[PDB]
Design an enzyme around this catalytic site. Structure first.
Site, PDB file in Angstrom:
ATOM      1  N   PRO A  77       0.825  -1.215   0.000  1.00  0.00           N
ATOM      2  CA  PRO A  77       0.000   0.000   0.000  1.00  0.00           C
ATOM      3  C   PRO A  77       0.864   1.273   0.000  1.00  0.00           C
ATOM      4  O   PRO A  77       1.897   1.329   0.679  1.00  0.00           O
ATOM      5  CB  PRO A  77      -0.785  -0.101   1.316  1.00  0.00           C
ATOM      6  CG  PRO A  77      -0.717  -1.512   1.723  1.00  0.00           C
ATOM      7  CD  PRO A  77       0.427  -2.183   1.040  1.00  0.00           C
ATOM      8  N   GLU A  78       0.438   2.296  -0.730  1.00  0.00           N
ATOM      9  CA  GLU A  78       1.087   3.609  -0.639  1.00  0.00           C
ATOM     10  C   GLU A  78       0.094   4.545   0.023  1.00  0.00           C
ATOM     11  O   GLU A  78      -0.995   4.116   0.433  1.00  0.00           O
ATOM     12  CB  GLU A  78       1.553   4.107  -2.013  1.00  0.00           C
ATOM     13  CG  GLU A  78       2.233   2.958  -2.792  1.00  0.00           C
ATOM     14  CD  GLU A  78       2.768   3.309  -4.172  1.00  0.00           C
ATOM     15  OE1 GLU A  78       2.931   4.498  -4.537  1.00  0.00           O
ATOM     16  OE2 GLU A  78       3.069   2.347  -4.908  1.00  0.00           O
ATOM     17  N   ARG A 136       3.563 -11.719   3.302  1.00  0.00           N
ATOM     18  CA  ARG A 136       5.010 -11.693   3.346  1.00  0.00           C
ATOM     19  C   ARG A 136       5.541 -11.418   4.749  1.00  0.00           C
ATOM     20  O   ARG A 136       6.750 -11.497   4.980  1.00  0.00           O
ATOM     21  CB  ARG A 136       5.524 -10.681   2.310  1.00  0.00           C
ATOM     22  CG  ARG A 136       5.060 -11.079   0.884  1.00  0.00           C
ATOM     23  CD  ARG A 136       5.673 -10.234  -0.220  1.00  0.00           C
ATOM     24  NE  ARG A 136       7.103 -10.469  -0.367  1.00  0.00           N
ATOM     25  CZ  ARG A 136       7.939  -9.702  -1.070  1.00  0.00           C
ATOM     26  NH1 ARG A 136       7.508  -8.616  -1.705  1.00  0.00           N
ATOM     27  NH2 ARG A 136       9.222 -10.015  -1.105  1.00  0.00           N
ATOM     28  N   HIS A 159      -2.681 -16.396   6.565  1.00  0.00           N
ATOM     29  CA  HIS A 159      -1.755 -15.325   6.772  1.00  0.00           C
ATOM     30  C   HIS A 159      -2.272 -14.231   7.702  1.00  0.00           C
ATOM     31  O   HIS A 159      -1.743 -13.107   7.708  1.00  0.00           O
ATOM     32  CB  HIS A 159      -1.363 -14.751   5.428  1.00  0.00           C
ATOM     33  CG  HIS A 159      -0.740 -15.761   4.525  1.00  0.00           C
ATOM     34  ND1 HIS A 159      -1.402 -16.294   3.436  1.00  0.00           N
ATOM     35  CD2 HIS A 159       0.478 -16.352   4.553  1.00  0.00           C
ATOM     36  CE1 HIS A 159      -0.615 -17.166   2.830  1.00  0.00           C
ATOM     37  NE2 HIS A 159       0.532 -17.216   3.485  1.00  0.00           N
TER      38      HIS A 159
END
Ligand SMILES: O=c1[nH]c(S)nc2[nH]cnc12
Length: 266
Positions: free
Chosen positions: A1-2, A109, A91
């Site tokens: 995300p930005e 991740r 996750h």
DNA sequence: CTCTTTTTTCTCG
DNA sequence: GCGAGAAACAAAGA
């Protein structure tokens, strides 16, 4: 995300979880709580979420009067609001349980982080990171921008990604901004003329504010519409609408980089 | 099979 | 100090 995605998430969370008492906090991956999971659990439990802020790509949960929980989603972090009987997914790493639901953090991740910080330590925290100004006309001073660029021989793209010139750009929107401002991503910043710097400055604010308005590019923050407005990122081999020109992909300081060479020469 | 791709920190030389 | 780019990690794909 930005920044636009993180701002979208902040808004959705602000609408839903502010005012709710944390009943418990559970972790299958406590290593992502950098300041210590037991400490966070012991402090935050029983406290009410008072607000959510943001600084660059960092979420800031205001929990009680004296604590701030700084969350960074990094590459793949996702929050979702779920009922209490919701099953754990592969996750999912952390969950913040309320009386009538739970806030789950997931991250394939496992890059994302949580940090419990005192309220009066939030500014020092961001100073230590040398986070630049928010991408707004009020905060993002072109003159300071201009001077930082002139004093540096860094490449403009990796320099923008450092968060120190201005907060909130990541790989997607830096590619879009440089296309909009017609600057080559490997252009050394002390080589930029004043007029390019001005356009770059305005471009950064325009692109980010537009992406925020469209809900970002796309489980909170997944209904964004900015991905239909992208001109260059991920569009390798497609047209720039410049007389048959195509978007090239290169690597710049290890990052995939999409640009139109015809429009973005040094 | 291997290797490359997709935010921030950290290491190298 | 620099600047590049691998690593924290997983999954997909070439
Ligand atoms: O179609 C176009 N071709 C070229 S070469 N330049 C442009 N600027 C805006 N549209 C165009």
């Amino acid at each position: 995300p930005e920044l636009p995605e993180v701002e979208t998430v902040r808004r959705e969370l602000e609408k839903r979880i502010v005012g709710q008492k944390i009943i418990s906090i559970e972790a299958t991956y406590p290593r992502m709580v950098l300041t210590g999971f037991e400490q966070l659990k012991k402090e935050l439990t029983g406290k009410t979420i008072q607000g959510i802020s943001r600084r660059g790509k960092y979420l800031i949960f205001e929990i009680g009067d004296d604590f701030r929980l700084i969350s960074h989603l990094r590459m793949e972090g996702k929050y979702r609001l779920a009922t209490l009987d919701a099953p754990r997914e592969k996750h999912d790493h952390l969950t913040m349980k309320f009386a009538d639901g739970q806030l789950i953090y997931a991250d394939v991740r496992k890059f994302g982080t949580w940090e419990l910080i005192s309220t009066d330590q939030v500014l020092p925290y961001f100073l230590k990171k040398k986070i630049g100004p928010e991408p707004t006309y009020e905060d993002f001073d072109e003159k300071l921008f201009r001077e930082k660029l002139r004093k540096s021989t860094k490449k403009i793209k990796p320099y923008l990604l450092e968060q120190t010139l201005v907060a909130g750009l990541g790989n997607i929107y830096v590619d879009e901004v440089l296309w909009l401002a017609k600057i080559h991503p490997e252009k050394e910043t002390n080589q930029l003329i004043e007029s390019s710097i001005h356009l770059l400055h305005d471009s950064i604010i325009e692109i980010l504010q537009k992406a925020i308005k469209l809900g970002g590019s796309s489980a909170l923050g997944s209904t964004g519409k900015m991905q239909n407005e992208l001109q260059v990122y991920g569009k390798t081999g497609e047209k720039c609408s410049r007389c048959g020109a195509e978007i090239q992909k290169i690597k710049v300081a290890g990052r995939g980089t999409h640009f139109c060479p015809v429009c973005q020469q040094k």
